[PDB]
Amino acid sequence: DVYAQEKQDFVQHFSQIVRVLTEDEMGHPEIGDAIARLKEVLEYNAIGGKYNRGLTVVVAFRELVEPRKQDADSLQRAWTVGWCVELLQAFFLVADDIMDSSLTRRGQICWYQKPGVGLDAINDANLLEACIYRLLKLYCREQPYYLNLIELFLQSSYQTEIGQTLDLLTAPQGNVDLVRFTEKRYKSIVKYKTAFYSFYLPIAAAMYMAGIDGEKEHANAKKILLEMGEFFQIQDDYLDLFGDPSVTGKIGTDIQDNKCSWLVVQCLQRATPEQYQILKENYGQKEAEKVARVKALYEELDLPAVFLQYEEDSYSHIMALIEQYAAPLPPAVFLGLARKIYKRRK
Amino acid sequence: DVYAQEKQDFVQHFSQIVRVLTEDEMGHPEIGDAIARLKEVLEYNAIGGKYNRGLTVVVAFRELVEPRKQDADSLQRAWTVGWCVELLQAFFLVADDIMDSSLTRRGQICWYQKPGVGLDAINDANLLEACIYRLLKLYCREQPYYLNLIELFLQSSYQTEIGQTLDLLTAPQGNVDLVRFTEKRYKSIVKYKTAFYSFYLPIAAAMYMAGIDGEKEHANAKKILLEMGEFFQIQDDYLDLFGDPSVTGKIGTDIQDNKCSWLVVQCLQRATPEQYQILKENYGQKEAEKVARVKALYEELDLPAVFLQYEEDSYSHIMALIEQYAAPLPPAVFLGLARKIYKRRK
Ligand SMILES: CC(C)Oc1ccc(-c2cncc(NC(P(=O)(O)O)P(=O)(O)O)c2)cc1
Ligand SMILES: CC(C)Oc1ccc(-c2cncc(NC(P(=O)(O)O)P(=O)(O)O)c2)cc1
Ligand SMILES: [Mg+2]
Ligand SMILES: [Mg+2]
Ligand SMILES: [Mg+2]
Ligand SMILES: [Mg+2]
Ligand SMILES: [Mg+2]
Ligand SMILES: [Mg+2]
């Protein structure tokens, strides 16, 4: 597994990231306390996941750049850009956990739930985002791809926030509206909210770093990676309810939060009129008893087995897309990522 | 007043901004509902202030670019960059109002206090930020200053968020700690949180658009503008308590929120031991009765008259800095801005 291999070097580079970001202090002691707080935010929220989005940048870069051009500086840049993707993710998750009223993340209390943090985490989240652009300037500003990366991170963040807006608008609190939860709407949500930044962004970053900037090259890659991202989000939705929290490191809130999840969309396609009412009376509410009722309806409709069939069909579909669209990139760039996300239970 | 003059054209350009941003829809109908929400967020939060930060870009640009190079496209770019500063401000204020538990802003309920918005405003705020970078790409990407502006907006946002972090760390909820509220700490807070983005950013943006990129040119400007920004924040703090809300369009929360405001710093320098206790028992708490007691202590110490003296001394100081550092820029670029902010009661 090419990810297990790169992973140690990647995670080891984290101190260097933290050191370089916490040395904006040297010229300005007056910001010392803010920098200390940034370090605490980095250590709590950027560490402890699987590093798969960041690691994808490094794996792809080694696979796309001739080994002779992989000098120490080039590699450092690669690990820094991977860390920029991790930082984006940390930004997103800190904010999303507030928005979704989540309890835990990566095996611990959500940052905003800590006594003394609360909605100060909005600022913390946005500091994480800032760090991306400081790292890109500090490590890449003289490279011919610098602007390309900046634009890519900014565009990916815009798209992601557009997705997040569709997510919140499709899920109004205190209102039951099942009629909105369609397959078509679901696919749009997840494409925007998850698939651009989790799949297109890291591979595209590595492409640009390898000098692969062609519009066609990027569009072909994107066809593969947006579909892989739809599957990843569907798996995330399944794991919200049916995943084991000691594996996933987080507690599910989709049913309470009235979310357009793949599960509710699937349920709706299959429910009888009686069951539609059951869903209607119980969905989108805080009461544990009502959440359990929704889960029992999902289990009655064999939605786990529906998920397992879908995962198998999606995996084939994605592999067909790799066959169509990988060239002239090595298929391994996509295959290692597919392997990483399929059968994933965390 | 050169601002009153430019203001109408500036504000008129707002529809065009909204139209160009709400036409990301044409190629992608699936994002239509998100775009509609973006429009509502823009119309609620970017309109209704004084436009002084955005307008500074336009005024300075007309003052720094030879009239012969001020073609229709150049002007459109100038008004768009001004609008980018307004959008940054709107991002900041939407988030800050959540963080500070504010009630009103620009003469209406804060966006997050609207039923149905709540903490979804975190996403709304960040969409406003995204729009900056889309506008810079859509209007300026072929200009030789494009990267300079991008970096300037990103750096200004980082600095601003560093300031905001010092603001929250100096103001812990449920803890009384007056010992932290020193002049030295106050000056650092406000330099970072307010002075970079409210004063340096717009003038610097116009400088770059005029081809003025020299390091020295920017550092001289910055000496003037960071000091003007310290004064503006001190005035903001004074107006938090002593301003008329129908003029300021917002209700003050500094005392409730345990803030390192200029007022509390001034109070502390002047309080007797008895009065220190009064402040200690009453500051940083939600009770109206305790807030009134703090205000009565401030009035007993003649802190309004202290503010009026300070405004006079600061105005002279700033004018001395314009005399030292304006050249070779026209002094009018700084003078119109000073005029705009001194004696300001809103
Ligand atoms: C400005 C900030 C709010 O923008 C964001 C935009 C998107 C996201 C985001 C995108 N994809 C997935 C997540 N989290 C997942 P999760 O299961 O919480 O990890 P989701 O809530 O189920 O969608 C968050 C987080 C933040
Ligand atoms: C990511 C986001 C939270 O970052 C921010 C960073 C800074 C600010 C900010 C900077 N200067 C002034 C304000 N608002 C003023 P206000 O009187 O609320 O308009 P302050 O709360 O008294 O400081 C907000 C707002 C948002
Ligand atoms: Mg979530
Ligand atoms: Mg969410
Ligand atoms: Mg989820
Ligand atoms: Mg405030
Ligand atoms: Mg504030
Ligand atoms: Mg204030």
PDB file of C-alpha atoms in Angstrom, chain B residues 35-283:
ATOM      1  CA  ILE B  35     -26.500  31.318  -5.733  1.00  0.00           C
ATOM      2  CA  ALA B  36     -29.914  32.719  -4.621  1.00  0.00           C
ATOM      3  CA  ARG B  37     -28.755  32.375  -1.024  1.00  0.00           C
ATOM      4  CA  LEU B  38     -25.452  34.166  -1.873  1.00  0.00           C
ATOM      5  CA  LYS B  39     -27.440  37.019  -3.299  1.00  0.00           C
ATOM      6  CA  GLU B  40     -29.532  37.319  -0.115  1.00  0.00           C
ATOM      7  CA  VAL B  41     -26.330  37.266   2.001  1.00  0.00           C
ATOM      8  CA  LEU B  42     -24.782  39.957  -0.214  1.00  0.00           C
ATOM      9  CA  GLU B  43     -27.848  42.207  -0.140  1.00  0.00           C
ATOM     10  CA  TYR B  44     -28.277  41.895   3.662  1.00  0.00           C
ATOM     11  CA  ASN B  45     -24.631  42.255   4.708  1.00  0.00           C
ATOM     12  CA  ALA B  46     -22.631  44.185   2.087  1.00  0.00           C
ATOM     13  CA  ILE B  47     -25.018  47.108   1.741  1.00  0.00           C
ATOM     14  CA  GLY B  48     -25.993  49.647   4.356  1.00  0.00           C
ATOM     15  CA  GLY B  49     -22.665  50.842   5.758  1.00  0.00           C
ATOM     16  CA  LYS B  50     -20.786  53.964   4.898  1.00  0.00           C
ATOM     17  CA  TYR B  51     -18.602  52.213   2.221  1.00  0.00           C
ATOM     18  CA  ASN B  52     -15.585  54.047   3.453  1.00  0.00           C
ATOM     19  CA  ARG B  53     -13.020  51.180   3.101  1.00  0.00           C
ATOM     20  CA  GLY B  54     -14.200  50.415  -0.466  1.00  0.00           C
ATOM     21  CA  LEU B  55     -14.471  53.946  -1.489  1.00  0.00           C
ATOM     22  CA  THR B  56     -10.910  54.600  -0.296  1.00  0.00           C
ATOM     23  CA  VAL B  57      -9.687  52.290  -3.076  1.00  0.00           C
ATOM     24  CA  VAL B  58     -11.547  54.256  -5.729  1.00  0.00           C
ATOM     25  CA  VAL B  59     -10.589  57.730  -4.437  1.00  0.00           C
ATOM     26  CA  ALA B  60      -6.926  56.753  -4.113  1.00  0.00           C
ATOM     27  CA  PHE B  61      -6.874  55.118  -7.507  1.00  0.00           C
ATOM     28  CA  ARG B  62      -8.204  58.248  -9.249  1.00  0.00           C
ATOM     29  CA  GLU B  63      -5.634  60.222  -7.334  1.00  0.00           C
ATOM     30  CA  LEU B  64      -2.746  57.943  -8.126  1.00  0.00           C
ATOM     31  CA  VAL B  65      -3.399  57.007 -11.801  1.00  0.00           C
ATOM     32  CA  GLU B  66      -2.856  59.610 -14.557  1.00  0.00           C
ATOM     33  CA  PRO B  67      -6.350  60.601 -15.791  1.00  0.00           C
ATOM     34  CA  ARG B  68      -5.367  59.502 -19.289  1.00  0.00           C
ATOM     35  CA  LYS B  69      -5.037  55.879 -18.073  1.00  0.00           C
ATOM     36  CA  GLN B  70      -8.397  55.944 -16.296  1.00  0.00           C
ATOM     37  CA  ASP B  71     -10.365  54.239 -19.063  1.00  0.00           C
ATOM     38  CA  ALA B  72     -13.758  52.559 -18.574  1.00  0.00           C
ATOM     39  CA  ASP B  73     -12.134  49.163 -17.932  1.00  0.00           C
ATOM     40  CA  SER B  74      -9.650  50.610 -15.448  1.00  0.00           C
ATOM     41  CA  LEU B  75     -12.360  52.302 -13.526  1.00  0.00           C
ATOM     42  CA  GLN B  76     -14.516  49.164 -13.486  1.00  0.00           C
ATOM     43  CA  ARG B  77     -11.527  47.320 -12.044  1.00  0.00           C
ATOM     44  CA  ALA B  78     -11.057  50.005  -9.400  1.00  0.00           C
ATOM     45  CA  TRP B  79     -14.768  49.849  -8.339  1.00  0.00           C
ATOM     46  CA  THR B  80     -14.503  46.039  -8.265  1.00  0.00           C
ATOM     47  CA  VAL B  81     -11.475  46.059  -6.032  1.00  0.00           C
ATOM     48  CA  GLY B  82     -13.286  48.576  -3.718  1.00  0.00           C
ATOM     49  CA  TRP B  83     -16.164  46.136  -3.627  1.00  0.00           C
ATOM     50  CA  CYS B  84     -13.689  43.357  -2.729  1.00  0.00           C
ATOM     51  CA  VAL B  85     -12.698  45.351   0.351  1.00  0.00           C
ATOM     52  CA  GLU B  86     -16.409  45.801   1.239  1.00  0.00           C
ATOM     53  CA  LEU B  87     -16.873  42.066   0.834  1.00  0.00           C
ATOM     54  CA  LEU B  88     -13.989  41.357   3.155  1.00  0.00           C
ATOM     55  CA  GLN B  89     -15.506  43.643   5.704  1.00  0.00           C
ATOM     56  CA  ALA B  90     -18.859  41.888   5.286  1.00  0.00           C
ATOM     57  CA  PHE B  91     -17.192  38.480   5.908  1.00  0.00           C
ATOM     58  CA  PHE B  92     -15.548  39.814   9.006  1.00  0.00           C
ATOM     59  CA  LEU B  93     -18.592  41.499  10.488  1.00  0.00           C
ATOM     60  CA  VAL B  94     -20.968  38.563   9.961  1.00  0.00           C
ATOM     61  CA  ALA B  95     -18.509  36.291  11.893  1.00  0.00           C
ATOM     62  CA  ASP B  96     -17.569  38.859  14.475  1.00  0.00           C
ATOM     63  CA  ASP B  97     -21.169  39.546  15.342  1.00  0.00           C
ATOM     64  CA  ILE B  98     -21.622  35.853  16.134  1.00  0.00           C
ATOM     65  CA  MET B  99     -18.393  35.838  18.191  1.00  0.00           C
ATOM     66  CA  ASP B 100     -19.295  38.981  20.117  1.00  0.00           C
ATOM     67  CA  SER B 101     -22.975  38.046  20.669  1.00  0.00           C
ATOM     68  CA  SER B 102     -24.066  41.192  19.006  1.00  0.00           C
ATOM     69  CA  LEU B 103     -27.687  42.164  18.447  1.00  0.00           C
ATOM     70  CA  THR B 104     -27.753  44.748  15.599  1.00  0.00           C
ATOM     71  CA  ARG B 105     -25.461  45.904  12.777  1.00  0.00           C
ATOM     72  CA  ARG B 106     -25.961  48.697  10.193  1.00  0.00           C
ATOM     73  CA  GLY B 107     -29.311  49.564  11.611  1.00  0.00           C
ATOM     74  CA  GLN B 108     -30.822  46.035  11.546  1.00  0.00           C
ATOM     75  CA  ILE B 109     -30.743  42.677  13.278  1.00  0.00           C
ATOM     76  CA  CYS B 110     -27.427  40.850  12.843  1.00  0.00           C
ATOM     77  CA  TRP B 111     -27.643  38.276  10.040  1.00  0.00           C
ATOM     78  CA  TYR B 112     -27.076  35.318  12.449  1.00  0.00           C
ATOM     79  CA  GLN B 113     -29.878  36.518  14.742  1.00  0.00           C
ATOM     80  CA  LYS B 114     -32.480  36.088  12.007  1.00  0.00           C
ATOM     81  CA  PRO B 115     -34.756  33.115  12.612  1.00  0.00           C
ATOM     82  CA  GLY B 116     -33.650  30.459  10.186  1.00  0.00           C
ATOM     83  CA  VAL B 117     -30.068  31.706   9.844  1.00  0.00           C
ATOM     84  CA  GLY B 118     -28.265  31.080  13.140  1.00  0.00           C
ATOM     85  CA  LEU B 119     -24.918  29.386  12.809  1.00  0.00           C
ATOM     86  CA  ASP B 120     -25.435  28.799   9.045  1.00  0.00           C
ATOM     87  CA  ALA B 121     -24.067  32.351   8.932  1.00  0.00           C
ATOM     88  CA  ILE B 122     -20.561  30.853   9.425  1.00  0.00           C
ATOM     89  CA  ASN B 123     -20.872  29.465   5.922  1.00  0.00           C
ATOM     90  CA  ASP B 124     -22.478  32.663   4.652  1.00  0.00           C
ATOM     91  CA  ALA B 125     -19.571  34.675   6.006  1.00  0.00           C
ATOM     92  CA  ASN B 126     -17.002  32.485   4.315  1.00  0.00           C
ATOM     93  CA  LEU B 127     -18.905  32.647   0.977  1.00  0.00           C
ATOM     94  CA  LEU B 128     -18.461  36.468   1.102  1.00  0.00           C
ATOM     95  CA  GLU B 129     -14.728  35.910   1.427  1.00  0.00           C
ATOM     96  CA  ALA B 130     -14.725  33.553  -1.547  1.00  0.00           C
ATOM     97  CA  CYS B 131     -16.392  36.184  -3.669  1.00  0.00           C
ATOM     98  CA  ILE B 132     -13.369  38.462  -3.310  1.00  0.00           C
ATOM     99  CA  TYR B 133     -11.126  36.032  -5.095  1.00  0.00           C
ATOM    100  CA  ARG B 134     -13.702  35.302  -7.840  1.00  0.00           C
ATOM    101  CA  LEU B 135     -14.083  38.980  -8.525  1.00  0.00           C
ATOM    102  CA  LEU B 136     -10.283  39.489  -8.645  1.00  0.00           C
ATOM    103  CA  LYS B 137      -9.981  36.654 -11.127  1.00  0.00           C
ATOM    104  CA  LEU B 138     -12.963  37.764 -13.250  1.00  0.00           C
ATOM    105  CA  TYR B 139     -11.809  41.408 -13.547  1.00  0.00           C
ATOM    106  CA  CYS B 140      -8.081  41.535 -12.974  1.00  0.00           C
ATOM    107  CA  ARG B 141      -6.431  38.224 -13.868  1.00  0.00           C
ATOM    108  CA  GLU B 142      -4.645  39.589 -16.894  1.00  0.00           C
ATOM    109  CA  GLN B 143      -3.245  42.645 -15.113  1.00  0.00           C
ATOM    110  CA  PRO B 144       0.375  42.799 -13.970  1.00  0.00           C
ATOM    111  CA  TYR B 145      -0.757  43.460 -10.426  1.00  0.00           C
ATOM    112  CA  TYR B 146      -3.151  40.467 -10.125  1.00  0.00           C
ATOM    113  CA  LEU B 147      -0.844  38.378  -7.886  1.00  0.00           C
ATOM    114  CA  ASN B 148       0.058  41.389  -5.796  1.00  0.00           C
ATOM    115  CA  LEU B 149      -3.620  41.983  -4.974  1.00  0.00           C
ATOM    116  CA  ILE B 150      -4.292  38.356  -4.193  1.00  0.00           C
ATOM    117  CA  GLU B 151      -1.343  38.229  -1.812  1.00  0.00           C
ATOM    118  CA  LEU B 152      -2.365  41.518  -0.254  1.00  0.00           C
ATOM    119  CA  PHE B 153      -5.935  40.406   0.467  1.00  0.00           C
ATOM    120  CA  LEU B 154      -4.641  37.041   1.826  1.00  0.00           C
ATOM    121  CA  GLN B 155      -1.959  38.637   4.011  1.00  0.00           C
ATOM    122  CA  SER B 156      -4.414  41.250   5.280  1.00  0.00           C
ATOM    123  CA  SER B 157      -6.861  38.521   6.257  1.00  0.00           C
ATOM    124  CA  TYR B 158      -4.177  36.542   8.089  1.00  0.00           C
ATOM    125  CA  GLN B 159      -3.044  39.637  10.015  1.00  0.00           C
ATOM    126  CA  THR B 160      -6.654  40.510  10.794  1.00  0.00           C
ATOM    127  CA  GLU B 161      -7.355  37.013  12.143  1.00  0.00           C
ATOM    128  CA  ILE B 162      -4.175  37.174  14.220  1.00  0.00           C
ATOM    129  CA  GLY B 163      -5.592  40.377  15.749  1.00  0.00           C
ATOM    130  CA  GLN B 164      -8.909  38.786  16.321  1.00  0.00           C
ATOM    131  CA  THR B 165      -7.158  35.922  18.149  1.00  0.00           C
ATOM    132  CA  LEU B 166      -5.389  38.423  20.504  1.00  0.00           C
ATOM    133  CA  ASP B 167      -8.845  40.089  21.043  1.00  0.00           C
ATOM    134  CA  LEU B 168     -10.499  36.820  22.137  1.00  0.00           C
ATOM    135  CA  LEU B 169      -7.542  35.636  24.196  1.00  0.00           C
ATOM    136  CA  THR B 170      -7.389  38.947  26.131  1.00  0.00           C
ATOM    137  CA  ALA B 171     -11.161  38.654  26.818  1.00  0.00           C
ATOM    138  CA  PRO B 172     -12.015  35.403  28.465  1.00  0.00           C
ATOM    139  CA  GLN B 173     -15.736  34.867  29.289  1.00  0.00           C
ATOM    140  CA  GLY B 174     -16.585  34.191  32.901  1.00  0.00           C
ATOM    141  CA  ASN B 175     -13.110  35.288  34.063  1.00  0.00           C
ATOM    142  CA  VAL B 176     -12.213  38.674  35.391  1.00  0.00           C
ATOM    143  CA  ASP B 177      -8.682  39.568  34.467  1.00  0.00           C
ATOM    144  CA  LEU B 178      -8.084  43.351  34.384  1.00  0.00           C
ATOM    145  CA  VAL B 179      -4.274  42.913  34.684  1.00  0.00           C
ATOM    146  CA  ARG B 180      -4.097  42.067  31.026  1.00  0.00           C
ATOM    147  CA  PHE B 181      -5.700  45.258  29.877  1.00  0.00           C
ATOM    148  CA  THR B 182      -2.614  47.412  29.266  1.00  0.00           C
ATOM    149  CA  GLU B 183      -1.905  50.079  26.674  1.00  0.00           C
ATOM    150  CA  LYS B 184       0.806  47.962  25.102  1.00  0.00           C
ATOM    151  CA  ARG B 185      -1.531  44.974  24.647  1.00  0.00           C
ATOM    152  CA  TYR B 186      -4.328  47.261  23.373  1.00  0.00           C
ATOM    153  CA  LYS B 187      -2.093  48.764  20.654  1.00  0.00           C
ATOM    154  CA  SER B 188      -1.039  45.317  19.399  1.00  0.00           C
ATOM    155  CA  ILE B 189      -4.597  44.056  19.303  1.00  0.00           C
ATOM    156  CA  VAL B 190      -5.918  46.950  17.293  1.00  0.00           C
ATOM    157  CA  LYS B 191      -2.987  47.183  14.907  1.00  0.00           C
ATOM    158  CA  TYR B 192      -3.606  43.617  13.865  1.00  0.00           C
ATOM    159  CA  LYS B 193      -7.403  43.334  14.133  1.00  0.00           C
ATOM    160  CA  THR B 194      -8.356  46.607  12.508  1.00  0.00           C
ATOM    161  CA  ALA B 195      -5.576  48.755  11.166  1.00  0.00           C
ATOM    162  CA  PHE B 196      -4.149  46.499   8.421  1.00  0.00           C
ATOM    163  CA  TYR B 197      -7.437  45.730   6.678  1.00  0.00           C
ATOM    164  CA  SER B 198      -9.301  48.965   7.279  1.00  0.00           C
ATOM    165  CA  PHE B 199      -6.511  51.420   6.298  1.00  0.00           C
ATOM    166  CA  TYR B 200      -3.448  49.752   4.809  1.00  0.00           C
ATOM    167  CA  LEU B 201      -5.318  47.358   2.539  1.00  0.00           C
ATOM    168  CA  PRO B 202      -7.413  49.743   0.487  1.00  0.00           C
ATOM    169  CA  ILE B 203      -4.688  52.282  -0.149  1.00  0.00           C
ATOM    170  CA  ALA B 204      -2.170  49.574  -0.858  1.00  0.00           C
ATOM    171  CA  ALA B 205      -4.602  47.921  -3.340  1.00  0.00           C
ATOM    172  CA  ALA B 206      -4.864  51.213  -5.223  1.00  0.00           C
ATOM    173  CA  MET B 207      -1.117  51.656  -5.135  1.00  0.00           C
ATOM    174  CA  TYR B 208      -0.561  48.260  -6.696  1.00  0.00           C
ATOM    175  CA  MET B 209      -3.214  48.986  -9.339  1.00  0.00           C
ATOM    176  CA  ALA B 210      -1.294  52.155 -10.155  1.00  0.00           C
ATOM    177  CA  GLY B 211       1.953  50.224 -10.582  1.00  0.00           C
ATOM    178  CA  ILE B 212       3.336  51.431  -7.231  1.00  0.00           C
ATOM    179  CA  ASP B 213       4.831  48.218  -5.851  1.00  0.00           C
ATOM    180  CA  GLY B 214       8.034  49.435  -4.212  1.00  0.00           C
ATOM    181  CA  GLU B 215       8.759  48.113  -0.794  1.00  0.00           C
ATOM    182  CA  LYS B 216       9.709  51.577   0.606  1.00  0.00           C
ATOM    183  CA  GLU B 217       6.626  53.239  -0.935  1.00  0.00           C
ATOM    184  CA  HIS B 218       4.442  50.649   0.823  1.00  0.00           C
ATOM    185  CA  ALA B 219       6.255  50.917   4.153  1.00  0.00           C
ATOM    186  CA  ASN B 220       5.928  54.711   4.255  1.00  0.00           C
ATOM    187  CA  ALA B 221       2.230  54.528   3.504  1.00  0.00           C
ATOM    188  CA  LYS B 222       1.836  51.875   6.101  1.00  0.00           C
ATOM    189  CA  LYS B 223       3.389  54.124   8.813  1.00  0.00           C
ATOM    190  CA  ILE B 224       0.591  56.628   8.245  1.00  0.00           C
ATOM    191  CA  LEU B 225      -2.243  54.214   7.749  1.00  0.00           C
ATOM    192  CA  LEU B 226      -1.588  51.855  10.750  1.00  0.00           C
ATOM    193  CA  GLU B 227      -1.650  54.833  13.087  1.00  0.00           C
ATOM    194  CA  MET B 228      -4.878  56.111  11.510  1.00  0.00           C
ATOM    195  CA  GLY B 229      -6.256  52.592  12.061  1.00  0.00           C
ATOM    196  CA  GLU B 230      -5.321  52.608  15.747  1.00  0.00           C
ATOM    197  CA  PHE B 231      -7.244  55.852  16.138  1.00  0.00           C
ATOM    198  CA  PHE B 232     -10.250  54.454  14.235  1.00  0.00           C
ATOM    199  CA  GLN B 233     -10.427  51.462  16.551  1.00  0.00           C
ATOM    200  CA  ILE B 234     -10.117  53.658  19.651  1.00  0.00           C
ATOM    201  CA  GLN B 235     -13.042  55.686  18.264  1.00  0.00           C
ATOM    202  CA  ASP B 236     -14.956  52.443  17.644  1.00  0.00           C
ATOM    203  CA  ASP B 237     -14.427  51.458  21.263  1.00  0.00           C
ATOM    204  CA  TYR B 238     -15.580  54.877  22.527  1.00  0.00           C
ATOM    205  CA  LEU B 239     -18.666  54.698  20.278  1.00  0.00           C
ATOM    206  CA  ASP B 240     -19.451  51.158  21.578  1.00  0.00           C
ATOM    207  CA  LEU B 241     -20.665  52.758  24.827  1.00  0.00           C
ATOM    208  CA  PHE B 242     -21.022  56.500  24.236  1.00  0.00           C
ATOM    209  CA  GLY B 243     -22.155  56.511  20.626  1.00  0.00           C
ATOM    210  CA  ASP B 244     -25.834  56.978  19.666  1.00  0.00           C
ATOM    211  CA  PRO B 245     -27.078  53.655  18.191  1.00  0.00           C
ATOM    212  CA  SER B 246     -29.258  55.342  15.576  1.00  0.00           C
ATOM    213  CA  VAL B 247     -26.042  56.871  14.236  1.00  0.00           C
ATOM    214  CA  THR B 248     -23.699  53.869  14.737  1.00  0.00           C
ATOM    215  CA  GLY B 249     -26.371  51.338  13.583  1.00  0.00           C
ATOM    216  CA  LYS B 250     -25.167  48.851  16.310  1.00  0.00           C
ATOM    217  CA  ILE B 251     -25.494  48.080  20.010  1.00  0.00           C
ATOM    218  CA  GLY B 252     -22.360  47.917  22.118  1.00  0.00           C
ATOM    219  CA  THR B 253     -21.232  44.669  23.817  1.00  0.00           C
ATOM    220  CA  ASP B 254     -17.634  45.400  24.896  1.00  0.00           C
ATOM    221  CA  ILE B 255     -18.301  45.538  28.655  1.00  0.00           C
ATOM    222  CA  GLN B 256     -20.503  42.424  28.640  1.00  0.00           C
ATOM    223  CA  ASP B 257     -17.904  40.589  26.491  1.00  0.00           C
ATOM    224  CA  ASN B 258     -15.020  41.441  28.853  1.00  0.00           C
ATOM    225  CA  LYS B 259     -13.148  43.246  26.027  1.00  0.00           C
ATOM    226  CA  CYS B 260      -9.784  44.934  26.143  1.00  0.00           C
ATOM    227  CA  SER B 261     -11.359  48.252  24.957  1.00  0.00           C
ATOM    228  CA  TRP B 262      -9.573  51.563  24.993  1.00  0.00           C
ATOM    229  CA  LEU B 263     -12.115  52.677  27.569  1.00  0.00           C
ATOM    230  CA  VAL B 264     -11.228  49.997  30.108  1.00  0.00           C
ATOM    231  CA  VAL B 265      -7.521  50.586  29.570  1.00  0.00           C
ATOM    232  CA  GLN B 266      -8.014  54.338  30.205  1.00  0.00           C
ATOM    233  CA  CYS B 267     -10.203  53.623  33.250  1.00  0.00           C
ATOM    234  CA  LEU B 268      -7.565  51.357  34.732  1.00  0.00           C
ATOM    235  CA  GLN B 269      -4.838  54.028  34.434  1.00  0.00           C
ATOM    236  CA  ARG B 270      -7.024  56.406  36.411  1.00  0.00           C
ATOM    237  CA  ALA B 271      -8.945  54.320  38.929  1.00  0.00           C
ATOM    238  CA  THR B 272      -8.453  54.462  42.629  1.00  0.00           C
ATOM    239  CA  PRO B 273      -8.244  51.175  44.480  1.00  0.00           C
ATOM    240  CA  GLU B 274     -11.956  51.492  45.344  1.00  0.00           C
ATOM    241  CA  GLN B 275     -12.808  52.041  41.714  1.00  0.00           C
ATOM    242  CA  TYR B 276     -10.645  49.209  40.569  1.00  0.00           C
ATOM    243  CA  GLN B 277     -12.858  46.976  42.746  1.00  0.00           C
ATOM    244  CA  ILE B 278     -15.998  48.452  41.242  1.00  0.00           C
ATOM    245  CA  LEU B 279     -14.667  47.632  37.796  1.00  0.00           C
ATOM    246  CA  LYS B 280     -13.536  44.204  38.910  1.00  0.00           C
ATOM    247  CA  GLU B 281     -16.955  43.235  40.318  1.00  0.00           C
ATOM    248  CA  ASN B 282     -18.948  44.589  37.364  1.00  0.00           C
ATOM    249  CA  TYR B 283     -16.928  44.173  34.157  1.00  0.00           C
TER     250      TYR B 283
END
